[PDB]
């Protein structure tokens, strides 16, 4: 049990172990800090109102469980989790400590940079997807890149969302993330957002303008009559030739985009399949693209009181084991 020191940052009081020094500000508030134990720069996130409602309390619990499970080089992992509280009764504040990453992918490329960056994302997604976890919100601001161009996955928003999440299909799979990667890859190659839509309707028109309106083989798999009516109403756009839209790009890169930006998610390439694509021949190492331990998601289907979620979160703070140096 370490000793804590109080401090006021951006009109909030931070109580953190003395082990973390020189706090500097950057869902919750985040501070950069120096960690005297590892000698490394860290990010300390103080959650805001972590147990205000059932939804917050479950969301706090979910976030701690996910971070505690991620042990992979291209996914953000948990260095430490702590509370100033000495008991469950006083437990009201949760802090999360992770590696401070240099910048996000948003604020920044040759084809070799794009290969390395997209390769690291797919490698992280393979790990995440193997544990039955879907990210659902992949976008450049959720991708941290240091000076070495080493990338970690963290955590408009609509520009990277899969068409089946736009239409609220209840049974989408992991490939909603592959769609996002496709949109990201296309932005890195061209400098431009692929689908910069102003709202949900406009967003889908821009998508269908590139990938074409869906054929009868995809229509026969849509369960919502209203969605089916809507889709068939809109004007028939032809599938464009990616080799023309992405003119001058590496043709292996165009080929991967065509396999990622597929409307039908049953036919969209997976992260593991994409890792073996020729586009990543330089980097692909099948002996060095691990999968994750199983992840118990059964709590997602539970309806519990705020104090029960809080209690379950307290247990996970106590049982936390720091990763090895
Ligand atoms: N097996 C599959 C494969 C893809 C599906 C899918 N793709 C999203 C989509 C978006 C736009 C469009 F024009 C055509 C399809 N949506 C839906 C769906 C279901 C209910 C409500 C809305 C979308 N079910 C699917 C089932």
Author numbering: 5 to 30, 35 to 116, 122 to 168, 184 to 353
Direct quotes from the study:
Against this background, we recently identified a novel class of p38α MAPK (mitogen-activated protein kinase) binders addressing a C-terminal lipophilic binding pocket (LP) accessible for small molecules located at several angstroms distance from the enzymes active site. The discovered 2-arylquinazolines bind to the LP and their corresponding co-crystal structures revealed a very distinct binding mode of these lipid pocket ligands (LiPoLis) to p38α. Here, we present a structure-based design, synthesis, and validation by surface plasmon resonance (SPR) analysis and protein X-ray crystallography of novel LiPoLis that target the LP in p38α MAPK.
These hydrophobic elements might fill out the sub-pocket and thereby form additional favorable interactions, e.g., halogen bonds to backbone carbonyls. The generally proposed binding mode and key interactions were still maintained, including the phenethyl moiety binding deeply into the lipophilic sub-pocket, the π-π-interaction between Trp197 and the core quinazoline scaffold, and a direct hydrogen bond between the amine in the 7-position and Asp294 as well as a hydrogen bonding network with surrounding water molecules and amino acid side chains and the protein backbone, e.g., including Ser251 and Lys249, and partly stabilized by contacts involving crystal symmetry mates, particularly Glu336. Substituting the phenethyl moiety in 4-position with bioisosteres in form of thiophenes 9g and 9h or replacement by fluorophenyl residues (9b-d) gave comparable and reproducible sensorgrams. The exemplified results for the characterisation of 3, 9c and 9m showcase the commonly observed shape of sensorgrams of the tested LiPoLis, that were reflected by slow association and significantly fast dissociation (koff = 0.04–0.06 s-1), typically leading to weak binding affinities.
